[PDB]
Design an enzyme around this catalytic site. Structure first.
Site, PDB file in Angstrom:
ATOM      1  N   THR A   1       0.857  -1.216   0.000  1.00 35.36           N
ATOM      2  CA  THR A   1       0.000   0.000   0.000  1.00 35.36           C
ATOM      3  C   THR A   1       0.879   1.247   0.000  1.00 35.36           C
ATOM      4  O   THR A   1       1.981   1.243   0.554  1.00 35.36           O
ATOM      5  CB  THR A   1      -0.910   0.031   1.249  1.00 35.36           C
ATOM      6  OG1 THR A   1      -1.641  -1.200   1.337  1.00 35.36           O
ATOM      7  CG2 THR A   1      -1.898   1.190   1.168  1.00 35.36           C
ATOM      8  N   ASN A  21      -2.394  -4.797  -1.927  1.00 29.00           N
ATOM      9  CA  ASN A  21      -2.634  -5.416  -0.624  1.00 29.00           C
ATOM     10  C   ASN A  21      -1.262  -5.629   0.007  1.00 29.00           C
ATOM     11  O   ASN A  21      -0.738  -4.726   0.649  1.00 29.00           O
ATOM     12  CB  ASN A  21      -3.390  -6.748  -0.723  1.00 29.00           C
ATOM     13  CG  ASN A  21      -3.708  -7.328   0.649  1.00 29.00           C
ATOM     14  OD1 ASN A  21      -3.686  -6.612   1.642  1.00 29.00           O
ATOM     15  ND2 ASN A  21      -4.012  -8.621   0.707  1.00 29.00           N
ATOM     16  N   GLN A  40      -5.989  -8.950  -2.905  1.00 32.99           N
ATOM     17  CA  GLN A  40      -6.954  -8.244  -2.069  1.00 32.99           C
ATOM     18  C   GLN A  40      -8.029  -9.148  -1.472  1.00 32.99           C
ATOM     19  O   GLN A  40      -8.688  -8.769  -0.505  1.00 32.99           O
ATOM     20  CB  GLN A  40      -7.633  -7.131  -2.872  1.00 32.99           C
ATOM     21  CG  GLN A  40      -7.961  -5.903  -2.038  1.00 32.99           C
ATOM     22  CD  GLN A  40      -6.702  -5.233  -1.515  1.00 32.99           C
ATOM     23  OE1 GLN A  40      -6.500  -5.110  -0.304  1.00 32.99           O
ATOM     24  NE2 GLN A  40      -5.840  -4.803  -2.434  1.00 32.99           N
ATOM     25  N   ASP A  43      -8.229  -9.684   2.238  1.00 33.21           N
ATOM     26  CA  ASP A  43      -8.723  -8.653   3.145  1.00 33.21           C
ATOM     27  C   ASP A  43     -10.167  -8.905   3.575  1.00 33.21           C
ATOM     28  O   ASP A  43     -10.716  -8.187   4.412  1.00 33.21           O
ATOM     29  CB  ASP A  43      -8.560  -7.268   2.508  1.00 33.21           C
ATOM     30  CG  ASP A  43      -7.201  -6.659   2.809  1.00 33.21           C
ATOM     31  OD1 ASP A  43      -6.267  -7.437   3.101  1.00 33.21           O
ATOM     32  OD2 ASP A  43      -7.060  -5.416   2.753  1.00 33.21           O
ATOM     33  N   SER A  62     -11.473  -1.940   3.825  1.00 29.00           N
ATOM     34  CA  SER A  62     -10.103  -1.420   3.849  1.00 29.00           C
ATOM     35  C   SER A  62      -9.941  -0.329   4.904  1.00 29.00           C
ATOM     36  O   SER A  62     -10.899   0.354   5.248  1.00 29.00           O
ATOM     37  CB  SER A  62      -9.724  -0.845   2.480  1.00 29.00           C
ATOM     38  OG  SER A  62      -8.459  -0.200   2.534  1.00 29.00           O
ATOM     39  N   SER A  63      -8.722  -0.169   5.412  1.00 28.67           N
ATOM     40  CA  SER A  63      -8.440   0.853   6.413  1.00 28.67           C
ATOM     41  C   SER A  63      -7.859   2.108   5.759  1.00 28.67           C
ATOM     42  O   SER A  63      -7.621   3.108   6.435  1.00 28.67           O
ATOM     43  CB  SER A  63      -7.441   0.326   7.447  1.00 28.67           C
ATOM     44  OG  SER A  63      -7.929  -0.822   8.115  1.00 28.67           O
ATOM     45  N   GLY A  84      -2.195  -0.908   6.812  1.00 31.10           N
ATOM     46  CA  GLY A  84      -3.321  -1.709   7.266  1.00 31.10           C
ATOM     47  C   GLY A  84      -4.139  -1.009   8.340  1.00 31.10           C
ATOM     48  O   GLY A  84      -4.401   0.189   8.240  1.00 31.10           O
TER      49      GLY A  84
HETATM   50 SM    SM Z   1      -4.636  -5.429   3.575  1.00 33.87          SM
END
Ligand code: SM
Lengths: 180, 359
Positions: A1, A21, A40, A43, A62-63, A84
């Site tokens: 990320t 990811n 992904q 997740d 997602s964060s 994350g």
């Molecule tokens: Sm992740």
């Protein structure tokens, strides 16, 4: 990320956080396209609750939090970061450091970070906090855990006069904030 | 809220200063691409897309064309919006697709197999943004990345170290991936030149035919074949059905400042606002950075937010998220009242909050 921020001469701003990811994702290139493919699907909740369960055409939670703070009606702070679930607390600290502690964008960026995500029940910290402070926290009942550096903020603070102030996270070698 | 500081000469850390435009990114080359785009007259969105494509070449670790992400855009006129280009699970995706025979999740399958991929949204997201809020044609913002892919660039410390550390676990296990990132049996090292001819071809075709090239054209065909021949699920219908989505940002007010962030499918935005709502009840400035008290309060506030996050968050198109209750200041106040500055409450005694009285 990874996250990046942009502010132009007219005062328009953009904050983008995108990813595969994990690092390099699956490591699988799509045939002769030269394009790496994400992983992904991991997740999704494999077995949280049913809310983030694997389902067709569903987007996994997602964060990632590209964020923009406004002051006196004008775009003032543009930021974001990878990491994350730690993204939430990293961005949070950028905001608190800027608003409550009055730190300039570079000071806020180079300051040490801490994090607690409920489970595991531990107050995760980077190197940089006082041994005296950490002992007080433990006396308070916190379980201090010294761990790996968190995040890679790439931010820009905008002065009401149009002056731009930026800072790249020291945690990422070869990164850069530049302007003209 | 105390007075702000943009930086003075006596500080230890100094921000980079600019009078016109600015770009901040994880990669020197990509940042410079964004700055060049701004100097050429492009707006923030134009530069952002150029940086996004550049990183897809210079930062294969996360920059991408085969992944997804989020974008927050705020116009000089105040209009603030969010672009959701997170990957979508394939149509043939099933709830237990990652469970072995015993019924336990097989990490290997959801991380390294062809089944771990969601339908890529980056190209769609950037085009949605560029077309509506940008001012340059796609080929213009893609050109810098195209050249970097075609002519190559020097591998620096970051890429070298990442290829060695994380790359070793997956790249060499796929012939086409290995042919690009590995050299003489080892990952590329600092100083080596990385040329990505196939990626350059994809970029050239996207610049020429637009996003359809990725979702309906040659690239689409290449992704489908890769999947079809290796037990993957992404089909041409999945790709043709993908759509980036413009959503309303999640926002809040913290001591007179308005905060705008990503809404679900992102969990971060809501909880950043929630935690700020909680912290607003405390005089953070008074405690100060690095103080045990400030850290105690924020650590405690975070516990409650993360607890709620494990229970109420999901893709808004499939699940109804109680964002109003989660960002409600009365609710935040009820949480703030539970925080003991001198004694932490074990996570075992903390559960997702009862939102009923706030909806
Ligand atoms: Sm992740």
């Amino acid at each position: 990320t990874t996250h990046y921020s942009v502010v132009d001469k007219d005062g328009n701003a953009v904050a983008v956080t995108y990813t595969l990811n994990t690092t390099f994702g699956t490591g699988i290139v799509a045939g002769e396209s030269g394009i790496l493919l994400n992983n992904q699907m991991d997740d999704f909740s494999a077995k949280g609750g049913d809310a983030n369960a694997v389902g067709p055409n569903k987007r996994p939670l997602s964060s990632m939090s590209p964020t923009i703070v406004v002051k006196d009606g004008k775009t003032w702070l543009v930021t974001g970061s990878p990491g994350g679930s730690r993204i939430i607390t990293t961005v949070l600290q950028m905001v608190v450091n800027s608003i409550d502690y009055g730190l300039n964008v570079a000071e806020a960026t180079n300051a040490p970070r801490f994090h607690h995500q409920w489970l595991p029940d531990e107050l995760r910290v980077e190197k940089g906090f006082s041994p005296d402070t950490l002992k007080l926290l433990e006396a308070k009942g916190q379980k201090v855990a010294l761990k790996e550096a968190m995040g890679s903020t790439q931010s820009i603070m905008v002065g009401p006069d149009g002056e731009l102030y930026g800072a790249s996270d020291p945690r990422s070698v070869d990164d850069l904030t530049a302007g003209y | 809220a105390p007075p702000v500081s943009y930086g003075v000469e006596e500080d230890v850390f100094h921000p980079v200063r600019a009078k016109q435009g600015m770009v901040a990114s994880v990669d020197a080359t990509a940042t410079q691409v964004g700055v060049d785009i701004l100097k050429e007259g492009g707006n923030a969105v134009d530069a952002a897309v150029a940086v996004g494509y550049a990183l897809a070449v210079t930062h294969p670790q996360a920059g991408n064309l085969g992944g997804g992400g989020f974008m927050l855009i705020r116009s000089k006129n105040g209009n603030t919006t969010a672009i959701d280009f997170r990957e979508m699970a394939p149509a043939k995706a099933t709830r237990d697709m990652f469970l072995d025979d015993q019924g336990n999740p097989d990490s290997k399958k959801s991380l390294t197999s062809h089944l771990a991929s969601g339908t890529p949204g980056t190209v769609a997201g950037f085009s949605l943004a560029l077309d509506k809020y940008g001012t340059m044609p796609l080929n213009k913002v893609v050109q810098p990345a195209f050249k970097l892919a075609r002519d190559g660039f020097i591998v620096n410390d970051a890429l070298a170290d990442d290829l060695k550390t994380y790359g070793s676990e997956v790249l060499p296990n796929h012939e086409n991936s290995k042919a690009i990132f590995w050299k003489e049996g080892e990952p590329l090292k600092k100083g080596d030149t990385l040329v990505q001819a196939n990626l350059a071809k994809s970029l050239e075709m996207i610049a020429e035919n637009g996003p359809d090239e990725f979702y309906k054209g040659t690239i689409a065909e290449q992704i489908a074949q890769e999947m079809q021949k290796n037990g993957g699920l992404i089909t041409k219908e999945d790709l043709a059905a993908y759509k980036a989505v413009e959503r309303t940002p999640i926002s809040g007010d913290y001591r007179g400042y308005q905060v705008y962030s990503m809404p679900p499918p992102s969990s971060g935005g809501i909880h950043i606002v929630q935690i700020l709502n909680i912290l607003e009840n405390f005089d953070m400035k008074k405690y100060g950075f690095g103080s045990a008290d400030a850290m105690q309060i924020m650590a405690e506030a975070e516990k409650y937010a993360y607890a709620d996050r494990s229970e109420y968050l999901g893709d808004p198109d499939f699940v109804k998220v109680p964002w109003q209750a989660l960002t409600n200041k009365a609710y935040a106040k009820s949480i703030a009242d539970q925080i003991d500055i001198n004694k932490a409450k074990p996570s075992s005694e903390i559960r997702p909050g009862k939102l009923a009285p706030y909806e």
